[PDB]
Amino acid sequence: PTFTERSQLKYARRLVVKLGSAVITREDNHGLALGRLASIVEQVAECHLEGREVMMVTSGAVAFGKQKLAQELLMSLSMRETLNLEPRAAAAVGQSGLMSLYDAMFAQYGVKIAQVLVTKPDFYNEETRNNLFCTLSELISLNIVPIINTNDAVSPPMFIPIKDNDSLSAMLAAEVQADLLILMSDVDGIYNKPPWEDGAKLMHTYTSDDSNSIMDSKVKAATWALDRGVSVVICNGMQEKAIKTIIGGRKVGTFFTE
Amino acid sequence: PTFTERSQLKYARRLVVKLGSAVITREDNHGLALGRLASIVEQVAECHLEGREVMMVTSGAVAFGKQKLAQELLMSLSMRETLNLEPRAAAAVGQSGLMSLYDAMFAQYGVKIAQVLVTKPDFYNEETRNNLFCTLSELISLNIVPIINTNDAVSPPMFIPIKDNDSLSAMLAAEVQADLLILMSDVDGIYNKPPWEDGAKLMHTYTSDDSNSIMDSKVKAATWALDRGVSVVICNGMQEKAIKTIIGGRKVGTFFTE
Amino acid sequence: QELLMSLSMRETLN
Amino acid sequence: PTFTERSQLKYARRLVVKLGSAVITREDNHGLALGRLASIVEQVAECHLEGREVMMVTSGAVAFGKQKLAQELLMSLSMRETLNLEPRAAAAVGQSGLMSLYDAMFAQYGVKIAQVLVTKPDFYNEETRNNLFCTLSELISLNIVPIINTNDAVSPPMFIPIKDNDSLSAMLAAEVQADLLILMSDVDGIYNKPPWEDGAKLMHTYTSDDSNSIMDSKVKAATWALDRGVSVVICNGMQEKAIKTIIGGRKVGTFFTE
Amino acid sequence: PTFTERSQLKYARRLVVKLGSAVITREDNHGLALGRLASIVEQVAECHLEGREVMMVTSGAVAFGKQKLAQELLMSLSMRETLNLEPRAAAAVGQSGLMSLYDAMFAQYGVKIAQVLVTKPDFYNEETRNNLFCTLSELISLNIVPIINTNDAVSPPMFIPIKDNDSLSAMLAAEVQADLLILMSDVDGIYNKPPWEDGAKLMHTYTSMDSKVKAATWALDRGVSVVICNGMQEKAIKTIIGGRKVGTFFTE
Amino acid sequence: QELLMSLSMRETLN
Amino acid sequence: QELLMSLSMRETLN
Amino acid sequence: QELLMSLSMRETLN
Ligand SMILES: Nc1ncnc2c1ncn2[C@@H]1O[C@H](COP(=O)(O)OP(=O)(O)O)[C@@H](O)[C@H]1O
Ligand SMILES: Nc1ncnc2c1ncn2[C@@H]1O[C@H](COP(=O)(O)OP(=O)(O)O)[C@@H](O)[C@H]1O
Ligand SMILES: Nc1ncnc2c1ncn2[C@@H]1O[C@H](COP(=O)(O)OP(=O)(O)O)[C@@H](O)[C@H]1O
Ligand SMILES: Nc1ncnc2c1ncn2[C@@H]1O[C@H](COP(=O)(O)OP(=O)(O)O)[C@@H](O)[C@H]1O
Ligand SMILES: N[C@H](CCC(=O)OP(=O)(O)O)C(=O)O
Ligand SMILES: N[C@H](CCC(=O)OP(=O)(O)O)C(=O)O
Ligand SMILES: N[C@H](CCC(=O)OP(=O)(O)O)C(=O)O
Ligand SMILES: N[C@H](CCC(=O)OP(=O)(O)O)C(=O)O
Ligand SMILES: [Mg+2]
Ligand SMILES: [Mg+2]
Ligand SMILES: [Mg+2]
Ligand SMILES: [Mg+2]
């Protein structure tokens, strides 16, 4: 990799920021988390109006869609039934709503966005893969923030092997040859033992050799994308000013390096 | 088909409205045509808040994207070069912008929309085709207006055989078993000889037998979708209150019937 | 009543 | 005045377009008329990206607010009351919603808008009047479209004497010394006798002398603003491409001249 | 007042939240602070979808307008001048843009907003004052969040005496007889001596910034109970109403 | 029932 | 040149 | 000058 110590992340030229699905929707499931969402959009816009080339891999279209569909189903019962959810339709509604919200929040900063929707078979056809990466590079070189997500509406991938919106981010940030990969999960980082025990220390540096022997999807994707040149940082999405302090060099999250 | 004379279109229960690409962008190519776009959205919202089940097959993501990319490329030259476009990137930018605009215009009426993006191989896998149609029926039965379009960003179909956003509309409105199919082209209808000649009368009723023997893509898709039960009406998108007078029964456009 | 008690909760609000 | 014959309106440098309240809301009162609204915004944006200095005097905040308040009041009854509107609150809600919609529709063209809210006592204080006109001129000289309206929320003027949103437009377009004043009413123009009679011809040119001796608010405001230099054109807002054919020189509406 | 100890703020039925002008725009002045703005809108929407009656007194239309006008003025010079701001116009542009943003962010939660613009002479005419308060009460009783601000576009009041967007908030929350008044300034609270000294402790309870102190003491003598907090803190309203020790609490 | 029949039409939809 | 160097920075971008 | 004449038209507007 090109970055070994955390003090060098100031010169990260190409980012790939992966927004989890617990960083978008609230715990009570009564709308979006505009706090975290708008704070991440603000940090990405101020890291993209600074020269870097950010490229977000969003998630959480299914959860947002499930909320919208629950509302539209509750608003269609008879007055008699009141007095006493498919993943694909949810994905459709949620993707539309989420892209509209991103569009508004980003246009508040003069930044423009684009919506690229990939699938699982688009990463086996060499022609389609090369076309996709030419498209991504061309969009990035025009100061446009692409927002990649799997086409959950017509062919969800759940039903490196792309099995979620994390292996997709690792494959992406390894082919575009990004410099830094920030996985904004909902946990503070990576512990040695699960948090509900005695000895649940945070690991501020995942040393490749030993720590590999002794969140499994995130660890697998991060180790893969690390063996390919990228340097991966796993942080907590529910923290204030996370990207701006990861790139700043302060000790935040887990930093996957040699 | 179920509708033979034009006076019976008042009872059309399931619509499929196909917006051409010349009904969305202006002739000078300096933005959208908010006039025609908002008028069609208003007619669809007032035909969907009336009991019908509308389902739009939009187009013109590539043109809108080409405009946005021309701007973002002109705003990135050096001050020295000023003093003396890929289809896929254009498709990405345009799809995002168009869905955001539809979202705003429809939410002005309380209506909700969903964005389903299909491709050419999604119509050969029987599993994927059946899943897509279950999704569409489930979205329609919740009073949500799906907005179908081909995934031009990663696999454009240009490069019944689905070759454009017209054969797609015919296949769609024949499988969902829609009642009416309205193709909003940019020409007043269908003439016997091209308009720039002597004898360029409009055909207010395309009688199946003879007229088949004596816009070729639109005619082919319309005849196909007519042999399958649907009844197709080709109208002029640049006309004021087109859908509301087609369904009203007034003589507008060409009506493909037996 | 039995017509006001058999409308969808969307028609009632309109 | 500076324009005597309708063929000279191509060189109109400063416009003042007054949108009536019947050009904004529909006849059934179930939302806005996005057709007419978006078409007028499109014509104003394409007449303002051409060098002119447009300045809209909007109306219809009370009607839009009344719709929103009827909804929010119907959605707050008990389930028991269901089974068997102040002008000021309506004005507040409607003004907010209308400005948001204008903002979206105009930003679709790169144009920026500003919201100036005047009252009746702000036209008697010479200090406040001069400050208001300095503000308007400064906003116009930055290629920003101001949108003037009376502060109906806290002091409606209904309850030259400014008695509505028409005398306001005449006073405005006479003090800013505009070149053309377009009153987009809901009637085709000005007839000699009311339309529901025999002899209801349209007057394509309101000759000052005779026609004065033989809609009374609009006529009074137009004659006033005509005696002050401005030249007033009264057209029908429910017509397609009204501003672009008035400025084009075609015979549309009534043209108040000497 | 009705609330004396901080543990009773859970039952605050009527709020009046005053957003400062340093809680809206960033320090570098290159756009809004969507972080703080969206977090406050989220807290107000989740405190208004819970039964309370929130009513925001926004500010910072002039700063946002100044940014927009600087852009539109820089984008209008000749190519030759490039190679080598009135408060009223700024107020107009900023008010429009801010209301549009609030509208979007609130409609993301199903909440509706209304824009009431008052001035200095509208608080002397008894008829106009009574009409304004009837309007506010009627808007609140329909589950609509009014957003009050001074009409800076045509008559800025800078040029209890209403001299800013703080005395306005105190007068408002004293006439509507609100229960709690939250002034979201940009400082952590109220210190005994200025922060850049030795002894700059925070006062967690002001036993009975000069403008904020004057307006708060006034609105306290009238029944309202005022809490001054730091707008740049995460989840400020939800922890003030929760009862946790945050900011300064003006009580007897 | 008499608790489900005395809620505002807004609480029922939530 | 002296016509391209006397346009407003808005006309150049259009 | 030759530094003001070699910036992208986006940096000049900021
Ligand atoms: N070794 C571990 N270290 C950290 N978290 C763990 C570990 N094992 C399990 N977890 C839990 O697994 C969860 C992983 O969340 P994740 O699937 O990344 O959320 P999302 O996909 O919605 O962003 C965390 O909430 C965490 O509590
Ligand atoms: N026989 C015909 N009848 C009508 N139009 C025709 C015919 N032959 C050619 N045309 C022309 O072909 C064009 C077809 O436009 P079309 O491809 O439908 O536009 P879009 O795909 O952008 O909606 C029309 O503009 C029309 O002028
Ligand atoms: N002499 C006249 N000429 C034209 N219209 C008239 C005349 N007398 C009455 N009217 C009617 O008066 C109405 C005036 O509408 P108006 O008040 O301008 O609507 P708005 O204020 O909502 O834009 C028109 O609808 C028209 O039918
Ligand atoms: N005694 C004091 N206690 C706290 N802050 C003080 C005091 N005296 C001066 N200040 C300073 O005065 C400033 C007041 O800010 P303020 O005018 O409320 O901002 P705004 O009006 O933009 O919200 C604070 O930034 C603070 O640093
Ligand atoms: N189909 C993807 C699912 C992604 C997903 O849920 O996984 P996660 O991002 O939580 O690790 C989506 O659009 O939400
Ligand atoms: N890929 C599709 C192209 C559709 C198209 O251009 O054909 P048309 O709708 O003009 O007949 C799109 O999103 O624009
Ligand atoms: N207070 C103004 C009323 C204007 C009005 O209704 O008169 P009109 O524009 O119909 O002639 C408003 O905001 O609607
Ligand atoms: N005219 C008001 C100014 C209010 C103001 O700046 O004072 P502050 O809210 O910072 O204490 C506005 O719209 O910003
Ligand atoms: Mg995962
Ligand atoms: Mg075609
Ligand atoms: Mg009138
Ligand atoms: Mg102050």
Residue numbers in the entry:
A (entry chain C), B (entry chain B), D (entry chain D): 45 to 128, 140 to 214, 228 to 282, 295 to 338
C (entry chain G), F (entry chain H), G (entry chain E), H (entry chain F): 115 to 128
E (entry chain A): 45 to 128, 140 to 214, 228 to 276, 295 to 338
Sentences from the paper on this structure:
The bifunctional enzyme Δ1-pyrroline-5-carboxylate synthase (P5CS) is vital to the synthesis of proline and ornithine, playing an essential role in human health and agriculture. The P5CS molecule contains two domains, GK and GPR, catalyzing the first and second steps in the biosynthesis of proline from glutamate. The GK domain catalyzes glutamate phosphorylation, and the GPR domain catalyzes the NADPH-dependent reduction of γ-glutamyl phosphate (G5P) to glutamate-γ-semialdehyde (GSA). Our results describe the assembly mechanism of P5CS filaments, in which the GK domain forms tetramer and the GPR domain forms dimer structure, and both domains form specific interaction interfaces.
We obtained a structure of the GK domain with the binding of glutamate in the P5CSGlu filament and a second structure of the GK domain with G5P-Mg-ADP in the P5CSMix filament. In contrast, G5P and ADP extend towards each other in the P5CSMix filament, and glutamate at the binding site is converted into the intermediate G5P. At ABD of the P5CSMix filament, the phosphate donor ATP becomes an ADP, associating with an Mg2+. In the P5CSMix filament, the same segment shifts away from the top of the binding pocket and forms an open loop, in which residue M213 interacts with G5P. The helix-helix structure (residues 105–113, 115–124) at region I of the P5CSGlu filament transforms into a helix-loop-helix structure (residues 105–119, 120–122, 123–128) in the P5CSMix filament. This helix-loop-helix structure is referred to as the ‘hook’ structure. The hook interaction forms strong contacts via hydrogen bonds (M119-R124, L121-M123) and salt bridges (E116-R124). The GK domain of each protomer rotates approximately 10° around its central axis, causing the horizontal compression of the GK domain dimer. By comparing the structures of the GK domain with various ligands, we demonstrate the conformational changes, which may be associated with phosphorylation of the substrate glutamate.
